[PDB]
Design a protein around this ligand. Structure first.
Ligand SMILES: COC(=O)c1ccc(S)cc1
Length: 460
């Protein structure tokens, strides 16, 4: 039975509003309702992995697991295996996979981050799960960020705290946060970003939604605007939104948005908003295609509607050769020519590079680069032709061209990372000097760039 080169992944996010679900929620797992929906002809085809994020979840883990498993069994006639479940307060993540994947999944990690301080510590934060699927690392983050139309900056801060402190994936990747640890990272939840229009425009917004005219609302969506200004979710993707705002509804219908200020809302307006979102970030040149992104129409227990997204994701096999794993394959090498880092820093320490990849036996430290002054005030760290020759464990191009090199640029003085990025080995040619590039981030903010040339030697 051959190893897959593609899997499909279901991502669900639902703020349950502290209410039990209705008896039928199959529409969610079938990607049926509004937006980019799944074709009817696929309804019996199981996804490989289902990742369910809930917020304001009033159920026990046992209660929700029974509903989820019985839901998927009704749809697919398959009894899914539980990979992981993790709850922080009323924020929960469940990972279910087809039984045939049980011996393809390993290195399961779970963690949570609590956001805020004092007042603002106690119900917001994130849960996450990571694991290996054969040769491919997968990470999943469900976050419930700070609420309220006037707190977009707090939401951005919550995002930076979650990506700094959530401890998932390979702990040997010590310079790298979750935004660099996974082949594919999915980040979803009640992100709580709002449509930033005046309160007086509530009925106008409702009108627009009834006409399915979302353009003038999406142009004021705080997540889209904050992402365009590079304030949050830098280098993440989101599918185009073609479904109605998923918040705030009157319960037990979808006919009414409940936006007016009430004691129960702290006297805050809740204009219709896309609170409930799915974003992703995959390593460069890895296949990832969003095949659905929408909301259900028929699950009305909460003041939020469930959101679904599905993806085709490229995966690789657990490669064995005669040589690696457990030695190098001298027929393979990675060389770097004419490389330089450009850093936004005001500092003047010397810098060196670290190269991390599962195609290496362990990470590789470079020599210090040569600091020059850039013509516009920047720091340019020149490596020229000084970078070490990297020795992969396997030389077969079917393996090596699918790999990635993570780069950290570190201060000689403190050994702290000033920037992290990633280079694909999916090159146009081998034995050929070719341009490489990655932006560099630190705590998920832009700190610079790394560029130069690469020359990859494989066994072919
Ligand atoms: C800070 O340490 C980590 O990054 C980490 C990652 C994964 C697992 S399972 C455990 C710990």
């Amino acid at each position: 039975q051959p190893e897959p080169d593609m899997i499909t992944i279901f991502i669900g996010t639902w703020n349950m509003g502290n209410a039990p679900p209705p008896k039928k929620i199959t529409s969610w797992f079938l990607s049926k309702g509004q937006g980019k929906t799944r074709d009817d002809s696929a309804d019996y085809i199981p996804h490989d992995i289902y990742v369910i994020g809930t917020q304001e979840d009033p159920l026990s883990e046992k209660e929700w697991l029974e509903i989820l498993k019985h839901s998927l069994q009704e749809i697919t006639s398959v009894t899914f295996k539980t990979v992981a479940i993790h709850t922080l307060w009323n924020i929960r993540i469940v990972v279910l996979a087809k039984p045939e994947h049980e011996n393809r999944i390993s290195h399961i990690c779970t963690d949570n981050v609590k956001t805020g301080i004092a007042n603002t510590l106690g119900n917001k934060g994130a849960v996450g799960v990571s694991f290996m699927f054969n040769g491919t690392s997968l990470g999943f983050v469900n976050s419930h960020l700070t609420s309220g139309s006037e707190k977009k900056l707090r939401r951005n801060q919550n995002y930076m705290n979650i990506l700094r402190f959530l401890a998932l994936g390979d702990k040997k990747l010590s310079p790298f946060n979750i935004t660099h640890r996974f082949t594919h990272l999915f980040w979803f939840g009640d992100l709580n970003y709002r449509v930033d229009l005046p309160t007086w425009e509530a009925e106008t917004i409702i009108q627009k939604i009834k006409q399915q005219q979302y353009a003038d609302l999406l142009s004021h969506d705080q997540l889209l605007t904050e992402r365009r200004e590079q304030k949050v979710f830098l280098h993440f993707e989101e599918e185009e939104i073609t479904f109605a705002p998923t918040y705030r509804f009157e319960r037990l219908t979808r006919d009414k948005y409940a936006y007016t200020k009430q004691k129960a809302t702290g006297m805050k307006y809740n204009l219709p908003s896309w609170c409930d979102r799915v974003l992703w970030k995959s390593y460069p040149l890895v296949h990832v295609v969003c095949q659905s992104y929408g909301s259900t129409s028929d699950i009305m227990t909460s003041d939020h509607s469930p959101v679904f997204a599905t993806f085709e994701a490229g995966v690789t096999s657990q490669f064995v050769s005669k040589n690696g794993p457990g030695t190098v394959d001298s027929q393979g090498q990675i060389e770097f020519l004419r490389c330089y880092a450009t850093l936004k820093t005001k500092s003047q320490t010397k810098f060196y590079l670290e190269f991390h990849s599962s195609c290496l036996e362990s990470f590789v430290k470079s020599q210090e680069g040569e600091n020059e002054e850039g013509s516009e005030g920047e720091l340019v760290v020149k490596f020229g032709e000084t970078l070490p020759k990297l020795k992969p464990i396997i030389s077969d191009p079917e393996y090596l061209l699918d790999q990635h090199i993570l780069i950290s640029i570190k201060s000689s003085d403190s050994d702290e990372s000033y920037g992290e990025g990633c280079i694909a080995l999916r090159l146009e040619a081998t034995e050929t000097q070719l341009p490489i590039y990655t932006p560099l981030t630190h705590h998920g903010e832009l700190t610079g760039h790394f560029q130069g040339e690469i020359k990859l030697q494989t066994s072919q």
